[PDB]
């Protein structure tokens, strides 16, 4: 059984054959990885081998070096780095030599080079790589395949490694990339590959953009490629401009007027969609960058010091030119429209919205003309475009200024609701919703509020595309008619708003919309239920009775669906069934929080029985969540079901296979803790057993870990002293977690780290508070964790000295410092002050916009003061 033979078998559509080939390769690798890789690389490097054997060889090598799972990736790289340098050198030489010898267009060797480079560049073990790749591209004698394949490897390296790891070789890397992009280069495939590689290399080229001469060379070559006769190269080059504008905003004053404006404007007017999208994306990005600079401005302003970055207001200056192009682009809709399709029309719409929020009022005079001229055009394309434009600028300009405009347009908008074209009504329904959210006064009035409700109600019967948007509109009108029910002169709950008079006619109609032939587009059903959930939540007092009976309808419906298992067959009739159950559970969660407490006690027996029968996969998660809400409403009175529910809750936790349902369960424990308090002690040994098992189970999804650590805090709070038993295991686990470190290069792993850090902070908070007790007398048990105070403070110190953060982490850390003050007292002051970055975290929190971060950081600062002023 030659290796070439086995590799060719990896392409068989035969489950068994496919599995035989796999076991053999998995055994060879397990048996002797070094030789396995060397052997695979030999196969890949021989152009004499079939295309299939070579590609399969490359895939085996690749899968041995990297993984889409960040954790598995690091382990693979460590395993490779542990291989005899001589063996690795031989694999490296074969892969590198394969460049330019592969038939099949997408190169396999290119991916293997990158997988290895990701393990080695960060430890400086492949110094020969960059120069060889650079040489392959800049050698005038090199073939097209050779240059393309090499640029592909460069592109993959730039895409998969922390830019800071390539920073010291940016000069060389750029020489190769800028070389492949030159106008003189013969092959358009090489220019394409080179231009895609530049896009991935922009983050580590700062030192280069800081040099006037290098910056100018890069800009010239990129702008030059936007004029390449090859469309693919034109588009990629335009994307580089989009990114360059975003990363080097402050360096563009020099280029905007003499080149970028012209290039980006032309691109927008292109009949080639892909080109138009880049030109539009370019200006949408400028708006985003300028909006942020304004925020940065007001920031420093209220903070004293002057901003470090200052806007140039490119959006404002280009406004008079952008608007006419965007409004006309809005005219490029079509009968056959796709919602998840990102075309020039949709993009123009978003860009218009960003321009309005970036330039405010300034946009009205430029757009109003377009709107009046086409609001009545017989051509549905222009009529829709006009309505769309109107809706796109409702956010940004001053309300006071827009009120009269919207007020006067209402007659036309209402009529638009009855327009023959489905597209027009779709947009009309959306604009009505926008008005309710931005300029409510225009709708919630004693002249339009009635005809509006009338058309909205009638809209629920229109096509899904419109009915769905009408649901969102209703959803906002209620949210508006509610946000304008209180205030007055006191701080209490509303009583009876403008919809109360028709609150019921609406719930019944949404309930009917909800009863329409499924499979329907634009998720009508989901939208109606969602709308119902919103109108209920946004109901005043005098709505209670209506909400009461709606609660009964949901239950009955939930029960009628249960015994619907009579025609549950064929993957299509059951998918609507699982989502109906899912939609009703989520709905029950909303009315449950709106009815009185007695209503829950008079219904609890019914729901548990129901929710019980239901616990597919997506339904479980929804059932558990429904139970969480019932647990929050029942409170201690839930203890009654704990015996019958015990085995099921344990089920959700034990699984983990479907981390989603597992997460709802963990979340449920936390709710059980808050509802039962100490009464949960008898069930804790079991729950803690499963939770600890999940943690040490390296097969459990990563997003479950922090949810569990955070629950340790809820349990400690609920059981207090009884938590002593687990302290050793829990604190050891927390120390480990707290020391978790991901590559600050990955945004997804970074957010993960923040979530985890926040969860550790909450566990600590729960432990400290739980041991201290809920009285004006710090309980001795707190002292058990007293020798852990420095670690905690130090852990927060490091968190402080980390540009990542998040108001969430800052909030929890502030809360924890304050807890330590109240638990250990005076001595905590020295420890905090001996760690300067903590002080910075508190100041940072007191500035934050997040009320949680501002409240806790402020409360903590106070507690520390009391230690300063106490015996």
């Amino acid at each position: 059984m030659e290796l070439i033979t086995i590799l060719e078998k990896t392409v068989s559509p035969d489950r068994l054959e496919l599995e035989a080939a796999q076991k053999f390769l998995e055994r060879a690798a397990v048996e002797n990885l070094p030789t396995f890789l060397v052997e695979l690389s030999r196969v890949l490097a021989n152009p004499g081998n079939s295309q299939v054997a070579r590609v399969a060889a490359g895939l085996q090598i690749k899968n041995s070096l990297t993984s889409k799972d960040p954790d598995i990736k690091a382990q693979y790289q460590q395993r490779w780095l542990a291989i005899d340098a001589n063996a690795r050198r031989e694999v490296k030489n074969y892969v590198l030599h394969t460049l330019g010898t592969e038939t099949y267009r997408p190169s396999s060797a290119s991916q293997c080079v990158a997988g290895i480079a990701c393990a080695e560049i960060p430890v400086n073990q492949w110094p020969e790589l960059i120069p060889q790749l650079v040489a392959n591209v800049t050698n005038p004698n090199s073939t097209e395949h050779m240059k393309e394949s090499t640029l592909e490897a460069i592109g993959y390296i730039c895409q998969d490694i922390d830019p800071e790891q390539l920073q010291d070789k940016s000069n060389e890397i750029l020489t190769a990339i800028i070389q492949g992009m030159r106008k003189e280069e013969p092959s358009n495939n090489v220019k394409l590959a080179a231009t895609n590689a530049l896009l991935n290399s922009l983050e580590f080229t700062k030192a280069n953009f800081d040099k006037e001469s290098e910056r100018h060379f890069i800009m010239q070559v990129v702008c030059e490629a936007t004029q390449c006769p090859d469309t693919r190269v034109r588009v990629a080059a335009l994307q580089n401009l989009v990114k360059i504008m975003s990363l080097y905003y402050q360096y563009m004053e020099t280029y905007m007027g003499p080149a970028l404006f012209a290039i980006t404007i032309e691109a927008m007017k292109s009949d080639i969609d892909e080109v138009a999208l880049q030109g539009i994306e370019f200006w949408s990005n400028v708006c985003d960058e300028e909006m942020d600079l304004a925020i940065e401005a007001s920031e420093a302003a209220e903070q004293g010091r002057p901003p470090e970055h200052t806007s140039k207001f490119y959006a404002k200056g280009a406004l008079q030119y952008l608007v006419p192009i965007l409004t006309q682009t809005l005219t490029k809709q079509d009968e056959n429209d796709d919602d998840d399709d990102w075309n020039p029309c949709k993009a123009a719409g978003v860009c218009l919205m960003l321009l309005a929020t970036c330039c405010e009022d300034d946009i009205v005079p430029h757009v109003l003309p377009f709107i009046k001229e086409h609001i009545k055009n017989p051509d549905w394309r222009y009529r829709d475009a006009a309505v769309m434009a109107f809706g796109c600028i409702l956010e940004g300009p001053e309300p006071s200024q827009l009120k009269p405009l919207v007020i006067q347009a209402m007659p036309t908008l209402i009529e638009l609701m009855k327009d023959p074209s489905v597209v027009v009504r779709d947009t009309a329904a959306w604009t009505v919703g926008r008005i309710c959210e931005l300029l409510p006064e225009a709708a919630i009035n004693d002249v339009y509020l009635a005809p509006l409700l009338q058309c909205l109600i009638e809209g629920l019967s229109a096509e899904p595309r419109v009915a769905s948007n009408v649901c969102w509109a209703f959803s906002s009108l209620a949210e508006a008619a509610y946000e304008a029910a209180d205030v007055a002169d006191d701080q209490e709950e509303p009583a009876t708003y403008c919809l109360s008079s028709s609150f019921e006619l609406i719930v019944q109609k949404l309930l009917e919309t909800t009863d329409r032939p499924d499979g329907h587009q634009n998720n009508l059903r989901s939208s109606a239920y969602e709308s119902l959930m919103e109108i209920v939540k946004n109901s005043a007092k005098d709505c209670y009775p209506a909400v009461q009976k709606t609660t009964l309808v949901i239950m009955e419906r939930l029960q009628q669906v249960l015994q619907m298992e009579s025609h549950i067959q064929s993957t299509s009739d059951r998918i609507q069934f699982n989502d109906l159950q899912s939609l009703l559970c989520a709905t029950l969660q909303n009315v449950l929080r709106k009815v009185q407490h007695q209503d829950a006690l008079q219904i609890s027996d019914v729901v548990m029985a129901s929710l019980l029968r239901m616990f597919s996969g997506g339904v479980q998660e929804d059932a558990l969540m429904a139970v969480s809400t019932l647990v929050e409403v029942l409170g201690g009175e839930f203890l009654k079901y704990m015996e019958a529910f015990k085995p099921f809750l344990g089920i959700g936790l034990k699984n983990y296979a479907e981390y989603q349902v597992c997460l709802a369960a963990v979340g449920l424990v936390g709710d059980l803790c808050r509802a039962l308090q100490s009464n949960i002690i008898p069930f804790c040994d079991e729950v803690m057993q499963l939770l600890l098992e999940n943690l040490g189970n390296e097969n459990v999804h990563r997003s479950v870990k922090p949810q569990i650590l955070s629950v340790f805090g809820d349990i400690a709070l609920a059981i207090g002293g009884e938590f002593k038993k687990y302290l050793e295991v829990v604190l050891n686990t927390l120390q480990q977690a707290s020391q978790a470190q991901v590559d600050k290069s990955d945004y997804d792993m970074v957010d993960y780290l923040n979530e985890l850090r926040e969860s550790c902070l909450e566990a600590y908070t729960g432990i400290v508070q739980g041991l201290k007790g809920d009285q004006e007398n710090v309980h001795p048990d707190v002292m058990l964790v007293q020798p852990r105070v420095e670690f905690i403070l130090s852990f927060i110190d490091h968190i402080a000295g980390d540009e990542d953060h998040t108001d969430g982490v800052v909030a929890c850390a502030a809360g924890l410092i304050g807890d330590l003050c109240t638990a250990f007292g005076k001595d905590v002051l020295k420890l905090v002050e001996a760690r300067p970055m903590i002080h910075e975290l508190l100041t940072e929190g007191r500035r934050s916009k997040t009320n949680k971060a501002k409240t806790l950081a402020r409360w903590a600062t106070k507690e520390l003061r009391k230690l300063k002023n106490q015996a």
Binding site: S582, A586, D622, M625, S628, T629, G670, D671, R674, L717
Partner: peptide, 24 residues
């Protein structure tokens, strides 16, 4: 299925917040 999780979570985190607060 997005709001069913992410939104029901916010409302939960708030449970602890108001809990720790009216205790702190």
């Amino acid at each position: 299925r997005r709001r069913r999780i992410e939104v029901n979570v916010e409302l939960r985190k708030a449970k602890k917040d108001d809990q720790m607060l009216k205790r702190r």
